[PDB]
Design an enzyme around this catalytic site. Structure first.
Site, PDB file in Angstrom:
ATOM      1  N   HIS A 188       0.797  -1.223   0.000  1.00 56.99           N
ATOM      2  CA  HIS A 188       0.000   0.000   0.000  1.00 56.99           C
ATOM      3  C   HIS A 188       0.832   1.276   0.000  1.00 56.99           C
ATOM      4  O   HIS A 188       0.310   2.359  -0.278  1.00 56.99           O
ATOM      5  CB  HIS A 188      -1.036   0.007   1.149  1.00 56.99           C
ATOM      6  CG  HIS A 188      -0.494   0.450   2.474  1.00 56.99           C
ATOM      7  ND1 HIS A 188      -0.189  -0.433   3.483  1.00 56.99           N
ATOM      8  CD2 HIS A 188      -0.234   1.689   2.960  1.00 56.99           C
ATOM      9  CE1 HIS A 188       0.236   0.242   4.542  1.00 56.99           C
ATOM     10  NE2 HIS A 188       0.217   1.529   4.250  1.00 56.99           N
ATOM     11  N   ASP A 225      -0.601  -7.403   1.443  1.00 54.78           N
ATOM     12  CA  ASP A 225       0.005  -6.077   1.530  1.00 54.78           C
ATOM     13  C   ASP A 225       1.511  -6.208   1.718  1.00 54.78           C
ATOM     14  O   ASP A 225       2.035  -6.029   2.820  1.00 54.78           O
ATOM     15  CB  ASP A 225      -0.616  -5.276   2.686  1.00 54.78           C
ATOM     16  CG  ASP A 225      -0.178  -3.811   2.689  1.00 54.78           C
ATOM     17  OD1 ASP A 225       0.516  -3.398   1.738  1.00 54.78           O
ATOM     18  OD2 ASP A 225      -0.536  -3.068   3.634  1.00 54.78           O
ATOM     19  N   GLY A 260       2.673   6.132   8.855  1.00 55.69           N
ATOM     20  CA  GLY A 260       4.055   6.539   8.702  1.00 55.69           C
ATOM     21  C   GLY A 260       4.988   5.379   8.998  1.00 55.69           C
ATOM     22  O   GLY A 260       6.120   5.355   8.520  1.00 55.69           O
ATOM     23  N   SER A 294       4.010   2.291   8.320  1.00 56.19           N
ATOM     24  CA  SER A 294       3.640   1.307   7.309  1.00 56.19           C
ATOM     25  C   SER A 294       4.836   0.873   6.479  1.00 56.19           C
ATOM     26  O   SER A 294       5.673   1.700   6.096  1.00 56.19           O
ATOM     27  CB  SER A 294       2.572   1.876   6.371  1.00 56.19           C
ATOM     28  OG  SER A 294       1.406   2.253   7.083  1.00 56.19           O
ATOM     29  N   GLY A 295       4.904  -0.424   6.203  1.00 55.12           N
ATOM     30  CA  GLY A 295       5.992  -0.970   5.414  1.00 55.12           C
ATOM     31  C   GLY A 295       7.180  -1.332   6.283  1.00 55.12           C
ATOM     32  O   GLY A 295       8.078  -2.065   5.850  1.00 55.12           O
TER      33      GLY A 295
HETATM   34  N1  AX7 Z   1      -3.326   0.412  14.953  1.00 51.34           N
HETATM   35  C1  AX7 Z   1      -2.831   0.811  13.764  1.00 51.34           C
HETATM   36  N2  AX7 Z   1      -3.566   1.375  12.785  1.00 51.34           N
HETATM   37  C2  AX7 Z   1      -2.765   1.638  11.762  1.00 51.34           C
HETATM   38  C3  AX7 Z   1      -3.020   2.226  10.478  1.00 51.34           C
HETATM   39  C4  AX7 Z   1      -1.921   2.379   9.568  1.00 51.34           C
HETATM   40  C5  AX7 Z   1      -0.598   1.944   9.951  1.00 51.34           C
HETATM   41  C6  AX7 Z   1      -0.367   1.356  11.244  1.00 51.34           C
HETATM   42  C7  AX7 Z   1      -1.469   1.209  12.139  1.00 51.34           C
HETATM   43  N3  AX7 Z   1      -1.541   0.702  13.386  1.00 51.34           N
END
Ligand code: AX7
Ligand code: AX7
Ligand code: AX7
Ligand code: AX7
Lengths: 243, 243, 243, 243
Positions: free
Chosen positions: C44, C91, C192, C194-195
């Site tokens: 994503h 993902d 932020g 993410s990944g």
């Molecule tokens: N709980 C939670 N929700 C999120 C949404 C995007 C990335 C990390 C995350 N951790």
């Protein structure tokens, strides 16, 4: 700063950053170290309304904001009593540090000009700070200190320019006698640089000619940056700062 | 407008809305009809810099903004030559419409006060507009015209209040002679009401005592709203508006 | 990262920062070095739609974002073909660098888990990144890399929780088999991050159990953070990354 | 709505606006009156998480939002149990009103299609609503109800288009069988139109073929608007709504 570059690490050892308490100690204005225990800045940065000393800190010369911080507490804020707004004048203030700083070749005071000193139109001077790099454009990380060479402009010419494209009567002063101007459509100060220094090298020795105060936009046509003329307020300064 | 409520359809027939071009003709300031061809407003709403007439339109008394618009173009914008900032003073201006408007009980002029009227404390006065309902809080749709009764306060008292909690010297006047104060911590004008009218009922007739000008925040302690004192600029107005 | 604190200089040698071109090379997602020439991240962050490679760059392990940047270009972006949204699954993505990197104690690869590893509750795991420290609350300057120990939670337990306070039928699985849950109301990943990697110390070695994927809000009750389960996509990864 | 115009006062008598409690009852989604006491809308507008009925209100057809509001309380919110996200499917819900509505020629129900009804590719249909007029471009005051004619697109073709310029495998469904598409790069639905109706006049009667559900951007190339296919959920609907 608009139209300038990152300053060399050995340049401008008197530049300081004023920080306000929050999610983090955020930079909101500049200033200059004029005595081991005193910082010179703009009144509008810390007034006209009284502010809590505990929510303010001073940061000495840093190449990049926030990275190697060493925040210093302020013991007293002195705003010129004639100040209400930058457009009216007397936009100048003093910050007394809790402790006198230990001067080094990397961090030291800037010299104030003598009462009779008058910086001639066209003389190349420099303004520095961590403010916006253009109208509404914030300085991006890693927030390096910026500098830009700006030529001094005669008070009368500056006042005249501000009337261009304005409804204000030509006989009504806009740029007053306790103010000084510098910059053009390519080089200027901007929001966030306020309270910072405008220095010119005369007989060798760098002298602080002004304090970044106000303007209409940044680097806008017929709208030069306006500064508080330091020489105008030397007596007031020396009323609190040891000569 | 902070406090107060929605104005009845029959009240304030002289209220006008200033619109700026863009995605839609958005309201940015108030004003008042003082002659079939002239609108009285604040200089800071249209100055100090000259802006393009084409980008400006006037909307006469409307119960709700945007819903029944009939925008009128302007032929001239005339700003008091002494104006530069609201804090300095002379925050007043005139707009001449391209055509004379037809008057009726729903839309007609407000009466200007005689030079000798002082509007002392205790005088029943109201301020109207489509401005914010509180600091940082905009008037929500359907955007009703609001009104609020505000208490008049003598200039000297008001000036003293503005000095409380400020560094400004007590003898340095803040609220000036060409100004007028009204409001408290519950009733006041706010951003968006600028240029609008402050009217007082004198001997059975409504007289416009002031023009919404400025203030430190809205309805803030020791900081009443400030208005341009109309009587002070009668001679200037009469140079342009027929009697 | 919600909760936890600033990571020590020597930890997480495999942490990577993804940058998007603009006013400055801004951090938007995390990643991990799993081979001198490959970075593992979330689909994503770079999909489902194809974006210009030129507008992307990778930054290897560094203590503070933007301070000591040495941006590396990418020659390929590989996204799992089953991916369309984090909630549906798959993902996960791979970025191939234009040049292999030199490894050391300060910068090196993270070890992928054996297909059979399940990472049951009670196992010590940490998640790292430069993401928000709380819901809609960005990491303030100087942007230090943060870390936080999060408790693993069995998938079926996590799924049940995600159904609490929701209209979704109990038999309609929300937390899918190719997913993994960790965190609570005090410790969690956030936008932020993410990944980024979720690593667990197993038999004395760090293994990347997951990739920060999604979740409802950050550290919200009955809503643990959700990660892509690495063991589920080993075959896919190995189709591109050599041993 | 993108690429359309103001709707005539006599059209779309079944259009409704969903409001949420706040500084004012703000519009957040659309819906349709399918029975004197039932409103049809999108699940993602009121789910997947449970919300209290007290903060929700329904406004029947009005030419301009907020102008002459007559807000109606909801007695029950029924979200399809198979719904979690729009991309997964089952994006449909029912709102039971506190009282049955007194239908008039100006405000009445829309007819649902027969189970066997199939809207052919190319058929001219219409989508209505008060949503954004373009990506990140809100509908400006006075907020008129807008409409736009959009052609039906075959499910398979739509799914194919969404794969163009994406990493998703061609054999992995993006647009599912319970979904329907319509629109092009000139005409489309947009944020804020969700839950609203897509109606097609079959022979001589208006039938609601879809419910605005989701999409990638508005009127974006190879990304037509996606709606929940009404015929797919007719049985579920008639399980609560009297035929
Ligand atoms: N709980 C939670 N929700 C999120 C949404 C995007 C990335 C990390 C995350 N951790
Ligand atoms: N030109 C110019 N320089 C400025 C510095 C601070 C605020 C406004 C300004 N306008
Ligand atoms: N009270 C008050 N009224 C105001 C109108 C415009 C700007 C600031 C203001 N403060
Ligand atoms: N094309 C399109 N139409 C939409 C309606 C609501 C949200 C996203 C959308 N994308």
């Amino acid at each position: 700063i608009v139209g300038g570059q990152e300053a060399p690490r050995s340049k401008w050892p008197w530049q300081v950053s004023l920080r306000v308490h929050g999610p983090y100690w955020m930079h909101f204005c500049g200033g200059s170290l004029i005595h081991p225990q005193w910082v010179l800045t703009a009144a509008h940065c810390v007034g006209p309304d009284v502010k809590d000393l505990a929510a303010l800190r001073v940061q000495l010369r840093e190449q990049h904001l926030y990275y190697q911080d060493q925040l210093l507490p302020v013991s007293r804020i002195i705003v010129h009593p004639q100040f209400y707004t930058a457009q009216i004048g007397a936009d100048i203030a003093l910050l007394e540090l809790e402790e006198p700083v230990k001067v080094s070749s990397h961090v030291h005071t800037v010299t104030l000009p003598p009462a009779s000193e008058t910086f001639p139109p066209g003389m190349p001077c420099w303004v520095t700070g961590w403010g916006d790099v253009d109208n509404d454009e914030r300085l991006p990380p890693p927030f390096p200190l910026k500098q830009v060479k700006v030529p001094i402009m005669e008070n009368h010419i500056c006042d005249a320019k501000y009337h261009l494209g304005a409804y204000t009567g030509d006989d009504v002063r806009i740029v007053r006698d306790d103010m000084l101007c510098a910059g053009n459509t390519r080089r200027d100060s901007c929001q966030g640089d306020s309270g910072g220094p405008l220095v010119c090298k005369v007989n060798g020795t760098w002298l602080q000619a002004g304090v970044v105060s106000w303007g209409e936009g940044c680097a806008q046509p017929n709208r030069p940056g306006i500064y508080t003329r330091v020489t105008y307020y030397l007596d007031w300064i020396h009323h609190y700062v040891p000569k």
